[PDB]
Amino acid sequence: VQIHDITGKDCQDIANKGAKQSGLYFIKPLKANQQFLVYCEIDGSGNGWTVFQKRLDGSVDFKKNWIQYKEGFGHLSPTGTTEFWLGNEKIHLISTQSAIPYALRVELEDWNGRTSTADYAMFKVGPEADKYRLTYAYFAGGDAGDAFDGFDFGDDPSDKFFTSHNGMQFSTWDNDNDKFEGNCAEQDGSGWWMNKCHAGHLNGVYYQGGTYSKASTPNGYDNGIIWATWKTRWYSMKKTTMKIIPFNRLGQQHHLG
Amino acid sequence: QIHDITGKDCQDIANKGAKQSGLYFIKPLKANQQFLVYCEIDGSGNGWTVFQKRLDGSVDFKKNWIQYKEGFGHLSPTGTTEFWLGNEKIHLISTQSAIPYALRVELEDWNGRTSTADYAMFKVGPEADKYRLTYAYFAGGDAGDAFDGFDFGDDPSDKFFTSHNGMQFSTWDNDNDKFEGNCAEQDGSGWWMNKCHAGHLNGVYYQGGTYSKASTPNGYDNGIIWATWKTRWYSMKKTTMKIIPFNRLTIGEGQQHHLG
Ligand SMILES: [Ca+2]
Ligand SMILES: [Ca+2]
Numbered sequence: 144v145q146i147h148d149i150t151g152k153d154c155q156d157i158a159n160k161g162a163k164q165s166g167l168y169f170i171k172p173l174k175a176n177q178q179f180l181v182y183c184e185i186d187g188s189g190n191g192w193t194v195f196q197k198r199l200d201g202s203v204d205f206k207k208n209w210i211q212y213k214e215g216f217g218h219l220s221p222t223g224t225t226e227f228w229l230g231n232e233k234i235h236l237i238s239t240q241s242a243i244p245y246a247l248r249v250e251l252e253d254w255n256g257r258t259s260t261a262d263y264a265m266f267k268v269g270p271e272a273d274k275y276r277l278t279y280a281y282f283a284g285g286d287a288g289d290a291f292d293g294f295d296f297g298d299d300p301s302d303k304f305f306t307s308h309n310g311m312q313f314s315t316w317d318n319d320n321d322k323f324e325g326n327c328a329e330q331d332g333s334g335w336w337m338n339k340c341h342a343g344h345l346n347g348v349y350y351q352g353g354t355y356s357k358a359s360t361p362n363g364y365d366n367g368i369i370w371a372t373w374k375t376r377w378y379s380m381k382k383t384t385m386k387i388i389p390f391n392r393l394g395q396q397h398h399l400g
Numbered sequence: 401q402i403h404d405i406t407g408k409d410c411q412d413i414a415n416k417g418a419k420q421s422g423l424y425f426i427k428p429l430k431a432n433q434q435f436l437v438y439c440e441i442d443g444s445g446n447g448w449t450v451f452q453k454r455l456d457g458s459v460d461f462k463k464n465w466i467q468y469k470e471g472f473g474h475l476s477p478t479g480t481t482e483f484w485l486g487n488e489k490i491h492l493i494s495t496q497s498a499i500p501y502a503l504r505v506e507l508e509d510w511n512g513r514t515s516t517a518d519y520a521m522f523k524v525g526p527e528a529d530k531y532r533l534t535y536a537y538f539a540g541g542d543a544g545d546a547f548d549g550f551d552f553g554d555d556p557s558d559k560f561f562t563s564h565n566g567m568q569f570s571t572w573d574n575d576n577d578k579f580e581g582n583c584a585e586q587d588g589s590g591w592w593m594n595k596c597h598a599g600h601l602n603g604v605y606y607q608g609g610t611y612s613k614a615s616t617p618n619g620y621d622n623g624i625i626w627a628t629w630k631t632r633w634y635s636m637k638k639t640t641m642k643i644i645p646f647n648r649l650t651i652g653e654g655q656q657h658h659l660g
Contacts, residue, residue: 211553
């Protein structure tokens with residue numbers, strides 16, 4: 144009732160078995176030693192998304208250390224109305240279990256009620272040993288734009304090279320892995336795949352109203368929940384959702400093998 | 401201005417048909433003299449004796465031991481004023497009979513959201529024990545168990561340094577915390593401090609809720625916080641701390657699974 148009884152490798156597997164209610168389900172990906180709970184989004188078209196990040200009201204402090212970001216934090220709820228981070232370890236187990244690739248959907252919401260998506264095909268989070276590196280093959284489309292591709296903020300020509308995210312390792316204030324002498328995780332106060340910071344950073348500080356400024360932080364860090372290709376760096380989203388689905392769920396190709 | 405009914409606490413006053421919230425005299429079993437309390441009486445016959453109220457930043461909570469012992473602020477028949485009833489009275493009421501009391505912490509967002517945290521068998525010890533706070537267990541509530549301690553992640557022992565059960569009371573001029581320094585003096589309040597706090601409803605009132613490390617010279621998280629419902633840099637808009645006999649508490653399970 145509070146936890147549904149259908150299980151599988153992920154939510155798509157669960158939706159396939161006939162599950163049709165979004166809520167909490169246990170899943171045990173392939174190389175997982177033990178099953179764990181996850182929130183599955185299931186729509187009419189039989190698409191079963193496994194949700195791994197959710198922001199919707201700034202009640203959960205996203206300035207957690209490495210272990211926390213690894214294990215997870217926040218709270219799962221049958222209504223999908225709580226903020227959380229499933230945990231790097233779990234995001235890695237799910238994303239790399241088989242030969243079947245996943246697609247990542249970033250879903251964003253305005254303080255004006257406007258939503259936008261951004262898909263990334265062939266998404267994977269590497270193992271801890273490689274600091275949970277993020278990788279995708281390509282941007283599959285979406286009206287939010289491909290901020291993971293870096294952005295030219297105008298502050299420096301090398302901007303796009305330094306604000307891209309594909310290939311970045313995960314960083315937390317206590318485990319810095321950015322292409323920088325400083326610490327993007329500590330100064331922003333979050334855990335993310337930081338470059339010489341970021342163009343899309345859904346784990347930033349939640350600013351009510353969306354609009355924030357250089358005066359909100361002592362050093363004018365643009366540390367809100369941003370997606371530079373959709374909204375300015377000084378506009379923090381109302382809601383974000385990061386979730387994955389087997390790629391096949393998403394015709395001009397000839398299959399050789 | 402003051403109601404006629406009286407008793408050992410507000411629940412007693414409710415069982416005697418008091419139907420309006422307001423000021424009432426109560427005389428706990430071990431109390432020598434009766435005193436005024438604000439009683440919250442709902443439509444179910446529950447009478448909550450209120451001992452702390454914050455809602456506009458009018459009263460300054462940086463008071464000393466004697467002041468925290470005797471209480472300060474104002475009581476008002478409308479329940480629109482801020483105060484701290486006094487550790488002595490809170491003590492006399494919580495430890496009057498064998499009957500266990502339950503504490504309800506009611507908080508309010510700057511967005512109109514309200515949440516609660518109930519603790520069972522709530523008690524405030526004698527002044528001799530520096531008014532130590534004790535409760536048996538978190539009886540539920542969507543505000544979360546801030547008193548259990550919180551793992552901010554800054555230090556592995558955060559949870560251990562931020563728990564409140566069994567902590568004595570501290571004011572700037574009477575440090576009884578588990579910290580080398582003075583949580584009370586640094587935050588500027590009186591509370592059951594540990595190596596500071598996970599829940600601290602007597603902190604500084606910040607308009608808008610949001611505040612930061614720059615709000616105070618040394619960067620303290622000294623707002624009205626409840627670490628399990630909102631971030632440490634979120635100061636509540638309103639907070640109420642009230643007690644009712646445990647027998648009146650309707651226990652209900654939550655609908656959230658905590659990952660951490
Ligand atoms: Ca660095
Ligand atoms: Ca001390």
